[PDB]
């Protein structure tokens with residue numbers, strides 16, 4: 560059954576609630592973004608209204624075959640009325656098409672649901688600046704001070720400089736990037752751009768990227784693996800065995816692989832700066848784990864919530880253990896005492 564933190568009180572609405580069958584009393588289902596833990600359950604057989612961004616709606620239609628008559632895309636930054644209730648979609652700074660949802664309840668209560676997000680000061684000058692928020696349904700993925708990582712721009716600078724140096728030293732090196740979902744496209748796009756290549760990938764991944772409104776994509780991506788020296792592979796193949804096997808398939812065009820595995824946070828963040836990151840190497844294969852996150856660091860999260868000053872916080876991540884819930888609640892009270900709300 561649908562958990563309480565997916566239900567918006569005072570409405571008929573749910574958020575990211577497709578894996579529970581028909582939800583009792585739900586008249587409209589919102590989807591914040593196209594990640595499988597959130598869309599799980601959607602198909603051609605779904606016959607209730609789904610509200611989402613334009614990009615998420617293109618993905619629903621083409622990848623899951625949801626019928627067009629049930630897809631209700633909404634423009635961003637625009638007040639819309641859904642089943643009698645004013646809503647706004649805002650950019651979440653997560654993966655392509657990902658949104659936060661502002662609900663203006665009939666009784667005067669204002670609710671923000673972040674979906675998954677990477678908090679940023681730029682959000683302090685969106686339509687959030689203009690009213691009070693009573694309830695915040697918060698992506699608490701990295702809600703503890705140990706979770707530190709660099710800016711996405713510093714991680715991309717490292718990746719571009721590493722790839723450009725390796726291929727300039729050896730024009731016969733191949734670059735490989737791992738993926739398993741949408742998001743983190745800057746990693747493979749910025750490396751291809753510095754090297755003067757397109758990114759080569761499977762037909763299924765190409766189809767997924769063509770759903771995304773990224774300008775000049777016919778320009779950066781391809782299914783012709785032979786024409787490309789940046790290849791995208793499933794994340795499970797980014798290991799010495801899978802990479803050795805890929806290099807055989809390339810028919811003697813290449814004699815070295817440099818690979819990237821974008822992860823979120825890992826514990827080597829506690830000890831090493833991005834500048835000082837080194838690979839794992841076996842023979843002519845080197846693998847870099849790079850901390851490219853599409854979720855808030857602790858500090859970014861704390862800044863956003865201290866600016867917003869909500870009256871009540873509802874965590875949507877790490878809710879399954881008493882120790883996780885108690886730790887998160889202790890941090891929310893510190894933040895509130897420090898900032899004075």
Ligand code: NI
Pocket residue numbers: 592594653675
């Ligand atoms: Ni996500």
